[PDB]
Amino acid sequence: EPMITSIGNPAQVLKVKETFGTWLRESANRSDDRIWVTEHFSGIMVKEFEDLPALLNSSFTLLHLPHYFHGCGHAVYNNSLYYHKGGSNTIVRFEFGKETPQTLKLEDALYFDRKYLFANSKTYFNIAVDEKGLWIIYASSVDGSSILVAQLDERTFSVLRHINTTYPKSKAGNAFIAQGILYVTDTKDTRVTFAFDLLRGKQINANFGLRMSQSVLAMLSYNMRDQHLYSWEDGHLMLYPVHFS
Ligand code: NA
Numbered sequence: 001e002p003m004i005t006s007i008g009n010p011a012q013v014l015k016v017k018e019t020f021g022t023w024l025r026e027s028a029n030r031s032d033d034r035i036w037v038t039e040h041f042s043g044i045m046v047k048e049f050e051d052l053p054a055l056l057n058s059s060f061t062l063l064h065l066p067h068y069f070h071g072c073g074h075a076v077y078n079n080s081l082y083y084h085k086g087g088s089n090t091i092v093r094f095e096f097g098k099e100t101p102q103t104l105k106l107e108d109a110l111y112f113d114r115k116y117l118f119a120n121s122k123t124y125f126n127i128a129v130d131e132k133g134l135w136i137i138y139a140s141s142v143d144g145s146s147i148l149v150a151q152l153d154e155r156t157f158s159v160l161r162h163i164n165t166t167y168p169k170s171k172a173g174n175a176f177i178a179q180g181i182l183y184v185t186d187t188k189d190t191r192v193t194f195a196f197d198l199l200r201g202k203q204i205n206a207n208f209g210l211r212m213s214q215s216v217l218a219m220l221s222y223n224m225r226d227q228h229l230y231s232w233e234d235g236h237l238m239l240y241p242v243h244f245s
């Protein structure tokens with residue numbers, strides 16, 4: 001049982017102009033220092049930064065995606081960007097350098113017309129990677145409400161199972177996944193108030209503070225390589241230490 005019981009004080013990395021965005025780092029290995037950024041909740045470009053100093057100096061190169069993204073729920077893993085293809089129920093896996101895409105359809109997912117998984121961050125899909133798997137958080141188009149998590153096989157970009165948390169998206173601000181546990185924030189994105197053991201398929205007790213700010217939270221992501229939460233909060237890129245008990 002590695003379960004998170006508290007979150008440390010955040011560190012501010014950088015202030016930027018756009019209210020919504022993502023910032024992403026690799027977690028498959030410890031040799032890649034690149035940082036990727038998307039701005040806004042709709043677009044087709046990604047900014048790539050060589051390392052933290054390049055990020056701090058706004059020194060980026062531009063990557064052109066094969067399809068527009070929606071939302072702020074993307075993830076990077078093993079030199080690939082996973083993102084929601086805007087206007088569809090399709091997830092794109094875009095491999096860097098070779099700059100070519102693969103796709104996965106989630107047939108029973110909400111995906112347009114503001115039927116968001118996380119309304120606060122205009123997000124329909126949240127891809128997450130941790131110590132226990134590659135995951136896609138989404139909301140059911142069948143009941144219109146339930147948060148589901150697809151567990152993927154990374155090597156084949158295919159779905160192994162669809163897990164029903166039974167938790168209604170209207171109660172969720174945002175979420176992240178660590179050591180195989182889904183942690184979901186309240187609607188004001190100040191506390192984690194729900195958790196779900198994805199491997200055992202059951203709710204588990206969790207309630208702990210995340211932050212005091214109530215500025216808009218655009219992105220919230222756990223990185224297993226450094227065991228920090230990464231966030232984008234109204235243009236502030238932040239890092240939070242995590243404490244496991
Ligand atoms: Na998230």
